[PDB]
Amino acid sequence: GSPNYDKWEMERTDITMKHKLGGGQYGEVYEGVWKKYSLTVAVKTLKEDTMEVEEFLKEAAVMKEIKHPNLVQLLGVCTREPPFYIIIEFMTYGNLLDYLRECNRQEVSAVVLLYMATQISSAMEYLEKKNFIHRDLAARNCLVGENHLVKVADFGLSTYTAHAGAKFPIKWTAPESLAYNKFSIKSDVWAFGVLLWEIATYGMSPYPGIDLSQVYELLEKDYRMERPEGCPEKVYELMRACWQWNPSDRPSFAEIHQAFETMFQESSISDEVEKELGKR
Ligand SMILES: Cc1ccc(C(=O)Nc2ccc(CN3CCN(C)CC3)c(C(F)(F)F)c2)cc1C#Cc1cnc2cccnn12
């Protein structure tokens, strides 16, 4: 309502800055508090004098355009001068990889594994529809909140090893992306498949006992990860479709989401009945 108003910009002093999250594993991401409203937030920062200004500013632009229940939601930025902030709502249970590695499987049961996958493929259908490419989909890049709410994120984490002049997470990376640097919503589909396998194993590292140097060549001979113990057949079938060698042969996220939503609804019906028996 005044000449230098920007609806996304906040004042840094609105925000109480506290500890770095995850002991550094998320980069420059800090727990903060938006004082006026209490709200605990997460704050990504870039200090002055860096060669990352353009990339950070590009990140802010993108988030201003992303609005979905299962994608991280921008609350505000500080980008009028250094240090830059990007502020989003705090997700209390941390990243999905660790959550799966530390959980109680009585709570995180098979209906919850289906819930997680449905939420993630819904965030990816949205990106698919808006013609975005995530480019680093993985359980380390999903966040968990109350009642197994899952939101997709991207910390810019690049485990990652040297490849084609940069750092790639080989075991999540689609073949055309490794071979030709070709990234698309279809390579995200390949990665979602590895994420499904991460969920199914409660967070095991992919391609167990296989050294990264052998992954591409095995994939090119049509080797794929085997079905995890206890992974339902239909879910494995979806994994193998995400891992079609030709990107065009892989399902869309719309299709994947509809599949998971159906299975989640069926599973949830069984879950509520067992619980209703428990109560009583
Ligand atoms: C402070 C912060 C800043 C930024 C982001 C962030 O996720 N950035 C992001 C940037 C771009 C994109 C889309 N592009 C991907 C690349 N692609 C080439 C283009 C499309 C997306 C996506 F989610 F939409 F994918 C996310 C997360 C946080 C957090 C947090 C937080 C909240 N609670 C907790 C608890 C523990 C740890 N962290 N934490």
**Same domain, yes or no: 150 and 224:** yes
By DSSP bridging, strand 161-163 and strand 166-168 are: antiparallel
Confirm or reject: Cβ of 88 under 6 Å from ligand 1: yes
Residue (of 59, 83, 131, 118) closest to 263 by Cα position: 118
**Domain that residue 78 falls in:** 1-90
**Same domain, yes or no: 57 and 118:** no
**Same domain, yes or no: 184 and 108:** yes
Confirm or reject: Cβ of 156 under 6 Å from ligand 1: no
Q: Is residue 18 part of a domain?
A: yes
> Any known ligand binding at 89?
yes
Q: Is residue 274 part of a domain?
A: no
Planar angle of CA 185, 188, 189, nearest 5 degrees = 95
Q: Is residue 217 part of a domain?
A: yes
Confirm or reject: Cβ of 157 under 6 Å from ligand 1: no
Q: Is residue 278 part of a domain?
A: no
Contacts 24+ apart (CB under 8 A), 170-175: 170/212, 170/215, 170/216, 171/205, 171/206, 171/207, 171/212, 171/215, 172/136, 172/137, 172/138, 172/206, 174/247, 175/216, 175/219, 175/220, 175/245
**Same domain, yes or no: 108 and 218:** yes
If you measure from the C-alpha of residue 192 to the centroid of ligand 1, how many angstroms do you get, rounded to a whole number? 17
Number of Cβ within a 10 Å radius of residue 65: 9
Hey, is 138 helix, strand or coil? Answer: coil
CA pair distance 15, 17, nearest whole angstrom: 6
Q: How many domains does the chain have?
A: 2
- The CATH number assigned to the domain holding 62 equals 3.30.200.20
If you measure from the C-alpha of residue 75 to the centroid of ligand 1, how many angstroms do you get, rounded to a whole number? 12
**Same domain, yes or no: 45 and 179:** no
Look up tokens 């506290």; give the residue: 18
